[PDB]
Design a protein around this ligand. Sequence first.
Ligand SMILES: CC(C)(F)CN1[C@@H]2CCC[C@@]1(c1c(F)cc(/C=C/C(=O)O)cc1F)c1[nH]c3ccccc3c1C2
Lengths: 210, 229
Amino acid sequence: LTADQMVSALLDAEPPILYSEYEASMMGLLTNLADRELVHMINWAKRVPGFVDLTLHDQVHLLESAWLEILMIGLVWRSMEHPGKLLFAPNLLLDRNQGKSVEGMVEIFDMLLATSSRFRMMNLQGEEFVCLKSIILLNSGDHIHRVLDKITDTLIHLMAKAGLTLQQQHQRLAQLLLILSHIRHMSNKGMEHLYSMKPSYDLLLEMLDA
Amino acid sequence: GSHMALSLTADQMVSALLDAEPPILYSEEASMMGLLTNLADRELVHMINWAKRVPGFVDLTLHDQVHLLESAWLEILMIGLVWRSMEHPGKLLFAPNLLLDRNQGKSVEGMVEIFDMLLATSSRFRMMNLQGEEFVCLKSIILLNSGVYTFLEEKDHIHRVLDKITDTLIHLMAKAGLTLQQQHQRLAQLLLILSHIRHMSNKGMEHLYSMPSYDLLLEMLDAHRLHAP
Ligand SMILES: CC(C)(F)CN1[C@@H]2CCC[C@@]1(c1c(F)cc(/C=C/C(=O)O)cc1F)c1[nH]c3ccccc3c1C2
């Protein structure tokens, strides 16, 4: 794949924006939405170049490690145009105060809002976003490393076509990748919260093995 | 005289970071945990001295300095550990007199998973032939990045300093003989390892709460004003 073919393949693989159903009410709605987004995520993963070249075991491990980071990056991306709010769905736009209804949720909401504001301030583009989402999938858990190098080349190509100087290109690449450390942190805090009040192997395996 | 962070050339940045480097300390299942806790506490004191010398860090308010150190202290201890453990495959060089293999971690409940992650990180840095000058840049990035979007002109300042550190990393790779494409690929590889260091710190923090607060760090950062030069 050329950088242009990589971009086209990632944009074409994009999952759809889902709608919510119709504290306890909010948690139920958010859980149901996450479960429905997960099914589309498996189908998206299968279309990421290089992902199907991996063994079923490697595919399962990468998705098991990255699913929350991928849900979170998708959330923060569609929430960019809504300062102070999280656009879980077009019919479920929640502010900080609504996160205070559930114990331990306000901290995660605050981190997601801060990430959305950073992407807004950076003017993150759709083509950069799909590259970042693919990196999260391949990195969160030699061929994988060669594919990651190809995504970096693709990110640079996008910035060069956008008219950034050679210096601006490395500075922007670094700024984008550093936010991935923040997304990892949020996923770890989210996973901790899930185990405090407790998406299965069968779900991933049935969809990954036809 | 005093160089402002944004005025530094790549060479001045490297010299400032190398000069700020903390020393390698010596060590003093219950005995093992005590030794590692005591070592971490002693490394923390040197870490405050190091942080104060990281260009741009003293331009921040005392409250912002504490917020950054509170978020980054374990990532900084971990990156230091993985760096000095590079020349020792299968072992973690906590101190020259405390070199531990993964089997030793098995003596403490939940410790093996963290040791395995630290060992994997050390092997990745060895395979990439991480240089001392790149390492100091990475440690500085961890400090300035780990708490920025966890708290306009002051936030922009941190981001401008981070850009200066990236420019420094690129300069080092360019002088090492890497093509422009190879520089971008190496930079990306290194920054992706930072997401793994964040992961390890989160898992490490979780283990601590199962078994350095804002107040403790605030007092240590403030007490630095009283130390002799
Ligand atoms: C997982 C955790 C603790 F970080 C909270 N999450 C973040 C905040 C909103 C609730 C949600 C969440 C979840 F991601 C998963 C579950 C799962 C339950 C079960 O399996 O029983 C329950 C949640 F509340 C969730 N929902 C989403 C939908 C679209 C896009 C993003 C999200 C997120 C991010």
